[model samples]
Target: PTKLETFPLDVLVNTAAEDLPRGVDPSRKENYLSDEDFKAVFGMTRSAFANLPLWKQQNLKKEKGLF
Candidate 1:
């Protein structure tokens, strides 16, 4: 209990805005968000999500929260 355990401090602090969270893997072919996940982003569907502007889309992608 007294020994210093190795912690992934790099990841702990450098986890700047990026990628799918927890179980979702962004490194795959079909790693995009689907209907439900899309809803989680903006309470909408993928098809309609396309209508958003680039800036809006960028914000929706993570809103700086790393979705």
Candidate 2:
């Protein structure tokens, strides 16, 4: 069985504290975190975050509401 490390509390604190600049382009690349930053802070890749059960459940629920 794969041992998944639980989410880090400090990461959530840091994320909430972020004073990020808004993207003027509407799809600003700078608004996103780098792969290394994501891994270090979230302890997972952006891809891995997307695959989490809770994340998937939220997405699925939204889709179900739309239909």
Candidate 3:
């Protein structure tokens, strides 16, 4: 399958893994989550989240697997 189809599923799963709420802009460039947005919703800075290890960063929910 092409990445176009797979990308949507990947985004949905990854967003949830980040504990991010849904229905935000899906653009990776212009509309990707900003530091201010992160703090506003999750009460933490993007820098803080960035410091986390890869596994601690995000995980697939249903699979209980690392993303």
Candidate 4:
């Protein structure tokens, strides 16, 4: 697939995830609770999402057997 060059990838992912209604587990990473993480629900713009500060970007915050 071709990428949309207008916005950064993380921005695009977050916007897409927002499409889901509130309080519903996402079909993929349904365990996440932070709205901020919504930016990474789908495969986010990897390069761009990686450049942001740790506090500003979304990632699978996995610990042991949990998300």
Q: Give, for candidate 4, the lowest lDDT window spanning 10 residues.
A: 58-67
Clashes of each: 0, 0, 0, 1
- lDDT by residue for model 4 over 4-67, one digit each (tens)? 1233323333545556445434432323334434344424554564566654443443321112
Ranking by TM-score: 1, 3, 2, 4
Per-residue accuracy of model 3 over 1-67 as CA lDDT, tens digit each: 3222122333443555345444343322112444454344335565665566645555311242213
* C-alpha lDDT values of all predictions: 0.41, 0.38, 0.39, 0.39
RMSD to the true structure for each prediction, in A, is 12.2, 12.1, 10.4, 11.4
Better of 1 and 4 by TM-score: 1
Task: Compute the lDDT for candidate 3.
Answer: 0.39
TM, every model = 0.41, 0.34, 0.34, 0.23
Which is better, 1 or 4, measured by lDDT?
1
The segments of candidate 3 whose C-alpha lies over 4 angstroms from its true place after superposition are 1-31, 60-67
The candidate that wins on TM-score is 1
Worst 10 residues of 3 by lDDT: 1-10
Name model 1 segments beyond 4 Å from true. 1-31, 64-67
Number of backbone clashes in candidate 1: 0
Cα displacement (Å) at residue 31, model 2: 6.6
Specify the highest-lDDT model's number: 1
- What C-alpha lDDT, on a 0 to 100 scale, does residue 1 get in candidate 4? 44
